[PDB]
Amino acid sequence: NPTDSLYCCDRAEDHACQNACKRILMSKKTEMEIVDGLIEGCKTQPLPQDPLWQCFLESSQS
Amino acid sequence: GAIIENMSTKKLCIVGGILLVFQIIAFLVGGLIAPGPTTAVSYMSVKCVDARKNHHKTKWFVPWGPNHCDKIRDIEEAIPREIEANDIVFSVHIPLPHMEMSPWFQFMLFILQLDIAFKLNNQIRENAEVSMDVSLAYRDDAFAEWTEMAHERVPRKLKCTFTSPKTPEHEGRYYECDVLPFMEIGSVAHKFYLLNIRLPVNEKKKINVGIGEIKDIRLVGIHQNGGFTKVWFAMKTFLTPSIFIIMVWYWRRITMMSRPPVLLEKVIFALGISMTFINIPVEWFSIGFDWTWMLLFGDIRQGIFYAMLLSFWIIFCGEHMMDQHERNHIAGYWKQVGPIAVGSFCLFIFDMCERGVQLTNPFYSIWTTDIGTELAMAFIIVAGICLCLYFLFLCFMVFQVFRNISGKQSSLPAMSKVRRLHYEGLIFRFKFLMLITLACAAMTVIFFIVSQVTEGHWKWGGVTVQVNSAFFTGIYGMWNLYVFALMFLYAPSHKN
Amino acid sequence: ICNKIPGLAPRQRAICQSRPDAIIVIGEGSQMGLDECQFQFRNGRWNCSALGERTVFGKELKVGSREAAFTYAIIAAGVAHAITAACTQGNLSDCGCGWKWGGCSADIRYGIGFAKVFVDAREIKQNARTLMNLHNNEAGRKILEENMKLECKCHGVSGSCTTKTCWTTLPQFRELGYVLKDKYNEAVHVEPVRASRNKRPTFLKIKKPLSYRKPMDTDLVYIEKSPNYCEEDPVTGSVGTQGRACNKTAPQASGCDLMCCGRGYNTHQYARVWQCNCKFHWCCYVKCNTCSERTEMYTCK
């Protein structure tokens, strides 16, 4: 459930990533389009050092 | 006299071979079957944050899992959030995730390792003393509430040194602090333990002020492996019936004779009684009850056996003096047995102060304060002096016995036949037991040194052998067989 | 999910999909290694930064010099250290473990075994650079293993050493960074070895005279000459020294005369806040005022 993981970028450092989060998650319904939207939304490749992607990967196990 | 005087060399060598086979088995049991004596698990405490919810009632902070605390990854992050001291509480959940503690772990021993960072304006004071506020709880299943075991203030004096130059280019490096003895209990009856450590600050009263700049609190938990405990209990369950049979036979051999028992045989029987007291697996009741005093009881049993053995050696040496000796009254040995009694009493009082008080306060440590250290060191020094005096007396007695033996051997052809064989039997008995005792003591010391200096195990073939546990099992079986051979060989021999 | 993460080999991404949570810790470890490298070289002309895109392992070095050797060694050491520290913190549940019989196996062996295979999995190709890379990663792991502190406590008959336990602890990573800096100050030159039958290099031997032996496993090893690092050049990955601050003093590698490679310095009144004079506790928030007087920060042109 992509909506259930919307809390992950409350850990994000930039408000731009947060706005991209809300727009994509309430606008997109498929995961690959979601991740492409995020990387094009606040212009950072997925990195296990980023707390946003850290939360996403961690919550993927739950 | 004793049986060993009359045994032919063939039967004596047969008995020696049987005892050697049993000794080999006792070594191999701990070498191969046992998994090692003890286990140390290092825990990194999780820096939970109090949001000022602990107003009156004792909330418990769980490091991980459901209901986990609002943890802080790096303690520097508290400054932006306006989080201050007296709020950050270090929490440890004693079994690592998806693990349980069991009574087969005979004890729990915890110590701390404070990670203190260097900083020019926040250095450790000259005599800094951390004053923790430690709380501990136990839980039986993963859904019940935590029940408070103990809640104590635990002061510890810091001993920290910084190797690198005290320069701003070297800020952030850690002090080389020593480990702090934290707590110990003799029972692990409960499955899960939660430990909460606070560091409250009141700079007016000088409490936890000037103790530096702590980044992290590491904790190490030491317990006895369940497999080693199982092996130990199996070994004791085997040994106890054998020592009972030997003791009953020996007591029958003593009583069913034409004379009252001599002092040497009473001392041998007392040594057998002490070793039976050790062999009895009363620890196998700790698995069903929360008896915290098991460590102290085991210490008392071991000390009793050590004192009895050291007294037996001097009684044997005294009894085997040929000339103007063989006084079968214990009162004549106060000079040489007295040091043993004094040293045993001093060590017993020291253990009562160290491990006896801990029953009422698991975090207690006699070395926490200077005066307690003075008392403990005085008792240990007096015990050491008594041991040195005992060893000097033992060497004197052995030398005098050998002088009398050498004097006796000159006149052996002159006495009658009965006296000739009697004195030859006394000589043979003393020589045999001295050789065996020296061999056993030398092997015990050598294997103890090996256990101290070795890695902990050795690899050969497709298996690894535990050296530490083989040492324990082998020495225990060795002294059990020493007592067995002592009681069997030195019982009175029948005459017909 | 992580099939798009930059800089991972296909086997590394398979491992990533296998266990999402291990990747978080390993990424934190690689970041710790890169941060330690950047702190160690803070005053150097090469500040452990390279021209390129950000990856989990940072910008890769286009020349196999001593700098790349130190970077890869610190990356491997950081990965292993983070895996072990996360295991001991309770962040990883599958780590180590058995428990009731043997007390579970060691933590450090699990950490090293995982970090070795994953970090070496990045070396997809095979070349002298690859053998150097594997040697440097193994050197980092070996140096981390050497610096573990061994501690023992006696809990025998009363307090005696009749029975004592011994356990290893991870070294705090700043000390390991200093140790690897010392090793970097003595890295050894190398060329690969080649034979008629194998047709490709299998191992590597020392270039420097007086010896022809294989380099020791704990030595940092490099194959290419180091550039000047103060000229911006994309063919070599040097970002240049322009814009970097300097102390305008005699000491080596810190002065503007050496930092700027003769181009001089530009300065301005920066006036840092320099908050000072606080009543520090052992941690956490304290109240104090600031004492920002003045500064003139010199920077290379």
Curated annotation (Swiss-Prot), chain A:
Mark the Knot repeats by their residue spans. Answer: 8-55
Entry comment on modification after translation: N-glycosylated.
Tissues where this protein is expressed: Expressed in various tissues and untransformed cells. It is undetectable in tumor-derived cell lines and oncogenically transformed cells.
Location in the cell: Cell membrane
Query: What's the superkingdom here?
Result: Eukaryota
The record describes the protein's role as: Functions together with ADGRA2 to enable brain endothelial cells to selectively respond to Wnt7 signals (WNT7A or WNT7B). Plays a key role in Wnt7-specific responses: required for central nervous system (CNS) angiogenesis and blood-brain barrier regulation. Acts as a Wnt7-specific coactivator of canonical Wnt signaling by decoding Wnt ligands: acts by interacting specifically with the disordered linker region of Wnt7, thereby conferring ligand selectivity for Wnt7. ADGRA2 is then required to deliver RECK-bound Wnt7 to frizzled by assembling a higher-order RECK-ADGRA2-Fzd-LRP5-LRP6 complex.
Task: Describe the family membership recorded for this protein in Swiss-Prot or TrEMBL.
Answer: Belongs to the RECK family.
User: Domain comment?
Assistant: The Kazal-like domains mediate the serine protease inhibitor activity.
> Which proteins does it associate with, and in what oligomeric form?
Interacts (via knot repeats) with WNT7A (via disordered linker region); the interaction is direct. Interacts (via knot repeats) with WNT7B (via disordered linker region); the interaction is direct. Interacts with ADGRA2; the interaction is direct. Interacts with MMP9.
Give the protein's recorded name: Reversion-inducing cysteine-rich protein with Kazal motifs
Taxonomic source organism: Homo sapiens (Human)
Q: Which residues of the full protein are shown?
A: 209 to 270 of 971
From Swiss-Prot, chain B:
Q: Which residues lie on this side of the membrane: Cytoplasmic?
A: 1-13, 252-266, 323-329, 400-429
> What family classification does the UniProt entry report for this protein?
Belongs to the wntless family.
The effect annotated for residue 390 to C is:
In ZKS; results in decreased secretion of WNT3A and WNT5A; decreased activation of WNT signaling
Which keywords describe this protein according to UniProt?
Cell membrane, Cytoplasmic vesicle, Developmental protein, Disease variant, Endoplasmic reticulum, Endosome, Glycoprotein, Golgi apparatus, Membrane, Transmembrane, Transmembrane helix, Wnt signaling pathway
Give the residue ranges for region: Interaction with Wnt proteins: 99-230
Q: Which InterPro entries match?
A: WLS-like_TM (IPR047843), WLS_GOLD (IPR053936), Wntless (IPR009551)
* Entry PTM: N-glycosylated.
Q: Which residues cross the membrane?
A: 14-34, 231-251, 267-287, 302-322, 330-350, 379-399, 430-450, 470-490
What is this protein's function per UniProt? Regulates Wnt proteins sorting and secretion in a feedback regulatory mechanism. This reciprocal interaction plays a key role in the regulation of expression, subcellular location, binding and organelle-specific association of Wnt proteins. Plays also an important role in establishment of the anterior-posterior body axis formation during development.
Q: Which clinical disorder is mentioned?
A: Zaki syndrome: An autosomal recessive disorder characterized by developmental delay, progressive microcephaly, and short stature, as well as dysmorphic features including sparse scalp hair, cupped ears, wide nose and mouth, short philtrum, and high-arched palate. Other variable features have been observed, including ocular, skeletal, cardiac, and renal anomalies.
Q: Does the keyword Endoplasmic reticulum apply?
A: yes
- Record's keyword annotation contains Transmembrane helix: yes
Could you tell me the Gene Ontology terms of the biological process aspect for this record?
anterior/posterior axis specification; cementum mineralization; exocrine pancreas development; hindbrain development; intracellular protein transport; mesoderm formation; midbrain development; positive regulation of canonical NF-kappaB signal transduction
Classification via PANTHER family: INTEGRAL MEMBRANE PROTEIN GPR177, PROTEIN WNTLESS HOMOLOG
| SUBUNIT field | Interacts with WNT3A. Interacts with WNT1, WNT3 and WNT5A.
Q: Name one GO molecular function term.
A: identical protein binding
Q: How does it sit in the membrane?
A: Multi-pass membrane protein
From Swiss-Prot, chain C:
PROSITE patterns (UniProt xref)? WNT1 (PS00246)
Q: Where is the lipid attached (O-palmitoleoyl serine)?
A: 158
Cystine residue pairs:
37-48, 87-95, 97-104, 152-166, 154-161, 230-261, 246-256, 260-300, 276-291, 278-288, 283-284
Question: What does the annotation give as the result of altering residue 73 to T?
Answer: In FUHRS; retains activity that is significant but not comparable to wild-type activity
Q: In which tissues is it expressed?
A: Expression is restricted to placenta, kidney, testis, uterus, fetal lung, and fetal and adult brain.
- Protein's GO biological process: angiogenesis; apoptotic process; asymmetric protein localization involved in cell fate determination; axonogenesis; canonical Wnt signaling pathway; cartilage condensation; cell fate commitment; cell proliferation in forebrain
Where it sits in the cell: the answer is:
Secreted, Extracellular space, Extracellular matrix; Secreted
Give the free-text PTM comment from the record: Palmitoleoylation is required for efficient binding to frizzled receptors. Depalmitoleoylation leads to Wnt signaling pathway inhibition.
Q: Which InterPro entries match?
A: Wnt, Wnt7, Wnt_C, Wnt_CS
In its UniProt record, a GO molecular function of this protein is:
receptor ligand activity
Quaternary form? Forms a soluble 1:1 complex with AFM; this prevents oligomerization and is required for prolonged biological activity. The complex with AFM may represent the physiological form in body fluids. Interacts with PORCN. Interacts (via intrinsically disordered linker region) with RECK; interaction with RECK confers ligand selectivity for Wnt7 in brain endothelial cells and allows these cells to selectively respond to Wnt7. Interacts with FZD5.
Q: What is known of its domains?
A: The intrinsically disordered linker region is required for recognition by RECK in brain endothelial cells.
Please report the name of this protein according to its UniProt entry: Protein Wnt-7a
Q: From which lineage does this chain's organism come?
A: Eukaryota, Metazoa, Chordata, Craniata, Vertebrata
